[model samples]
Target: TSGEAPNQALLRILKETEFKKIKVLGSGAFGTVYKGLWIPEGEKVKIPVAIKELTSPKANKEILDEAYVMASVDNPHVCRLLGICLTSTVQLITQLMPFGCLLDYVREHKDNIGSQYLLNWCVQIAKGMNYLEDRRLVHRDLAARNVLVKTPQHVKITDFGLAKLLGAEEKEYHAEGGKVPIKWMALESILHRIYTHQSDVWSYGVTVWELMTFGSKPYDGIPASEISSILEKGERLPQPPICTIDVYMIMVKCWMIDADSRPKFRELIIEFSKMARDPQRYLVIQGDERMHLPDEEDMDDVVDADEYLI
Candidate 1:
């Protein structure tokens, strides 16, 4: 029945059936997510489930898109779709994440953890992206909000609302109908309005920054419109507060102006795997506990144009 709450039917099904809402997990522009339990019949058993409810009509397409993409791919690193409610309105159900998103985890233990944990998460992210890339799928919107973690720190890529499938042949038309995070987008993606696996590489660089800063916002104070120009002119966001030189180098390479120069997900898996295994060998922790900031002298002879582009 159509009512004030558009998704009332789905909510009712959840309330009346074996499922029980436990607590709210997270929320965003699209909707709120809840941790729920599904009690099976004839037994005192319950299974954890992540329930997503959308309040806005505009988010329907995006939500459906995310569901489709996630259902098509099956991997431990990618969040699994459990089921969907197709009553009055759509409600997505998936496997519950015990640790929740990485953002929450970092907020709770920011100062206690070292870079090793972040590096390991990055490796898992690369593995998930590699799976998508192999299937010619592009996760146009990749950020901390879209990544989840389970116990033992296994990373799972979620929120495929902005995912796109590549055509058999390259096309000139740009993917439309949704917002893209310009600050995390590659120059080519921002200018041409086209995205590929390499564009995800660019977003991965920003993800690295997210990890280093303990879930701080990317380009926090910078205007989104100017990000493309800034990147095109050879500039990047300042290093995270506690980033190491190795982390800085990886981000720089990921943000290379030339899409071809960006490291593939496979290469990233190897690089981050090594870093995770031996963080001390890669990171030098100075007494100051802050990332080295660039000086004015460093920009004196550097070219302002995109030398990496063809």
Candidate 2:
């Protein structure tokens, strides 16, 4: 179950005997991600870890492919894979983020998080994405749900199930495309399976909206089926109610219909770097309420959790 055995020379293919499963942290199609402990070979101590138990007989070795892609990166904003193991369950081991997923953290602790800090987290997401794009990896799904929080203040991009390395001749990924996350995807993504670093830019815009809104659902009031039509007609989600015009401008830039006009990860890196400095601050004010908010027309824009499951 491996695509070239995973750079396993660098990864210790430990036996299942090494890890002691604690409890399940979360689960998905391939298997369950469990909270567990690992005692390194000959070590006296056990460290808290995350074990993704591959229970599906259909589980692909490509999971190891995703693991290597994850291991190859060194950015602090991206999660790192520790190793892999094969026993009763093929376990993919990695470091654990105690704060849980970013979405849950943001929703439960919105009031305590300031816009500047949250913006910093966005910058971190962009930075991690910058590394991926630089290496030619396109994260097909780049959303708040895919990011993990380390501290109340720290976040790292996770979940590479839909990630790919762009081929030299074929810049976009359309082969074997699966169900579309219409809300988090670009107009180009659904229309044609064609995916670019720019496709990710569109999702980044939606993610920034989530960060500014404290994990609110995107495309409020609009059904997933209609998102494509609206996006085709030049309608984009509104800027977060609390973010600054400059920051909102970044989101607008991200939502540009012309993929050519969207900002590159390097450009985003520079932009976020500027905002991180005190000379130009990122603002999330609690001030004047704007009119024509999407949710005002129909509260349905405040999406139910299951709606995003699609």
Candidate 3:
């Protein structure tokens, strides 16, 4: 009926024909992402978009619901969800990040990216996180890989607000059963299953550490089973060879044993913004230094869904 057609228009339900998938961008346990061109109905202009197709059996209404969470916020540092498509399988359309993930982008441009650019990106991330904080949203999985490079100098955070929204108003989050990114997780999250804005701050610190190290793997050579022990013993990742102590101090503040002691995203934005203004003062360069890549063990650090209970 004519009434049903207008109702569908109100929902931003995209059609498969609107998107022309070009190539696979990436894939994971969640699903596969493809670089595509979204040619709206009868529109001559083609818009680039990232189309994520859900393939995992675990994907349900909850996973697809992340789009609603994304739609609630708008920030330059956060990726924008354009629309949703439902046919045989579900598809999510988002802004295209041509440069791909921040992790891989940093690794590829380690030699060429200046410290100023890195510091600027830190401020951008802080601003984005601050916006989320203001919106009462917590990024449960904050990491370099979760951030995407849209341009040479611009990056946007993705995969946020899902877990927090699902968990609701609980001060701490308890996962029923699923994998966790241990390396990027805070001590409380690993031992107590507690996730909050503070825990997000802790992961932000690790992400900054990644930026300072040019995408080096965090906790290099450490076993996931032994991470908690070292954290209890007051050990944190060492300073990057090219990072000044001032920048490293921020990471120390984030890794504080007391969650309440970690600075909020607002404070972090102030700190990083100040540092960005005077980038050279916070970054040390050693031309002879080699970039440490993510090791095989680092890839295996994620807790399995079955083993996560332990």
Candidate 4:
């Protein structure tokens, strides 16, 4: 039941939110993600679902409004809303990601699982964000942590609390004094207080970098307090330990100083989909095992492990 986003006053339902908590998924700028149990309309089975319950009663209106927005998202690559529950607090009931959020899954199985799935997930995220970009919706909080997976390969972009829709002729959004994720931000966005499809692209690049490094946090050890100096110095996170040179170059494109020059999500889908093919399809080999050299002289021809380590 929707148009722009669910509850778009300019344009967009709710229900029983009594769910039993199974486990804590993670905490975010808005609140905590919970694995909860719920029963479907025509079925008696108690199935699992993700519940993003707000942290403050005072935030009910804003959070509930955001929850309604998430409820209207329709995409195979984006997380779908099963329902919403609001009272003194707000809760968004949606499909449960069995494998977990992209960050958690990769951290747990980076060595065990293949990288193909990670790239595929990136493609799916791009598709979903492309849909949003067309709608002029900026998902200010995109990151590996925000994406969830139903299976190892099925990606679903979630956490719409930070999403904002542009007015008819608005060009960009500027955040007033408040906390924001600085490391994932592009140079223009962080220093100029501006945002657009380009800013979100930069964040998306960082997310893929996180996946390549097996859930490594953006800016790894750099404190948010010191990001201004670092970014101004043209320093960004080093190449992820397991990504190819081609892939890293794409990330560089995402961080272009001129936001207008940054690659759009639609462009990235083409790049990544092609990356899923031959020439750049590299694998992460674990441990000290080496490919047999033809001769002592040919040892020089051996590719450096650092060039492609798992």
> Estimated TM-score per prediction?
0.80, 0.84, 0.85, 0.81
In candidate 2, how many Å is residue 165 off? 1.1
**On residues 5-109, what C-alpha lDDT tens digit does candidate 2 reach at each position?**
233336557677777656888887646788766656564455567887654555646677777677666667887777778676567777778788888877987
For each candidate in the order shown, give its overall lDDT on alpha carbons. Answer: 0.73, 0.74, 0.77, 0.72
lDDT of 3 at 284: 71
Better of 2 and 3 by lDDT: 3
> Local error of candidate 1 at 268, Å?
0.3
lDDT of 4 by residue, 1-310 (tens): 3334344432113446445555887786658778766644443345566777764555777767676566556677777776667544667777777777788877977566555665677789999999988878888889888888777767788878778887657879987776778888877777877878789999998998888888888876878878888878887777876667888888888877778888989999998888666423653535313322112432443332112111
Error of 1 at 115 (Å): 2.6
Question: What order do candidates take by lDDT, descending?
Answer: 3, 2, 1, 4
Task: Judging by TM-score, tell me the better candidate of 2 and 4.
Answer: 2
lDDT measured at residue 212 in model 1 versus the true structure, 0 to 100: 77
> Candidate 4, overall lDDT?
0.72
lDDT of 3 by residue, 1-310 (tens): 2221121212357888877656898898547888877667654445677877764545647556676677666788888777788877777778788888888988998877776778878888988988877666778788998998887778899975344642334566665556788888899998988888889899999999998898899988888889899999999999888788889999899999999999988899898889878777888765423433222332333221112110
Can you write out model 1's per-residue Cα lDDT over 172-252, one digit (the tens) per residue? 227765577887788888888878899899999888788777888877888887887777788886777566677788888
Query: How many steric overlaps are in each model, in order?
Result: 0, 2, 0, 0
Better of 3 and 4 by lDDT: 3
Point out the higher-scoring one by lDDT: 1 or 2: 2
- The most accurate candidate by lDDT is 3
For model 3 the local lDDT of residue 225 reads: 83
Model 1 regions lying over 4 Å from their true place: 1-16, 40-45, 55-59, 170-173, 284-310
Least well predicted 10-residue stretch by lDDT in candidate 1: 301-310
Model 1: pairs clashing at backbone N, Cα or C within 3 Å = none
